[PDB]
Amino acid sequence: DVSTSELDQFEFWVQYAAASYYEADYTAQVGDKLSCSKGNCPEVEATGATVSYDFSDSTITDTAGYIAVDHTNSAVVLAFRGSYSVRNWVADATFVHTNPGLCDGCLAELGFWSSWKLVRDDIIKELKEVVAQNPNYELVVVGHSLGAAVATLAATDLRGKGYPSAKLYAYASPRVGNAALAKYITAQGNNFRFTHTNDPVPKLPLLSMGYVHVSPEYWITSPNNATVSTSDIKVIDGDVSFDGNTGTGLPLLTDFEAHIWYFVQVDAGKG
Secondary structure, rough: XXXXXXXXXXXXXXXXXXXXXXXXXXXXXXXXXXXXXXXXXXXXXXXXXXXXXXXXXXXXXXXXXXXXXXXXXXXXXXXXXXXXXXXXXXEEEEXXXXXXXXXXXXXXXXXXXXOOOOOOOOXXXXXXXXXXXXXXXXXXXXOOOXXXXXXXXXXXXXXXXXXXXXXXXXXXXXXXXXXXXXXXXXXXXXXXXXXXOXXXXXXXXXXXXXXXXXXXXXXXXXXXXXXXXXXXXXXXXXXXXXXXXXXXXXXXXXXXXOOXXXXXXXXXXXX
């Protein structure tokens, strides 16, 4: 578608892423290882790875994471985571752118870147160381989300630085840146891324614113828891618017858951 391986790786890575877231791982320580717891992662744981380182987141920142390583594979790783818261861121946141640197244109976213840167440196340183240680390883880166874105850126840165490769992964893532850155890264490669378915874261831121893323893517588818495968895844490549895631548519937351787942758951750781 793828392969397985790749797936495985992717698954593984894522786881780582888852782881891262946791815291534991881152924281842881170083080484340680890673782981986771718941488971897722496982694988890673296984491987083981550880850581190383880481870172955381716291216050310142957131872121966281870581690184680781692984070984097984190887690787290283880184992762891342871122923131958581896422848812717130897617728802518310713112873115721115820145640138870173890396490359251109590239630138881227710122926150893432820132975271890464711160851381880176440380890481880178650580890585380187670780790587260184380881070486081979690778690285890877891673993451997842935111972471993845951161892771991616870281890776790228790383690659550049050194690384490259690294890887890445892423896962888812857313875117870152632118394209360129894416491219660168892618290229680088590795890467992976893733895414788942738807997710837312891845877617863113856216493319438219510117831114873118890276590639490639992966895516896954498946658913948540578931597982895955391969087938478922796817791848794518690238971114665119339509395719894957872115395519578916825117873113838513318711758717856221797827997010976391891726594969596995892652876151758981815491878431």
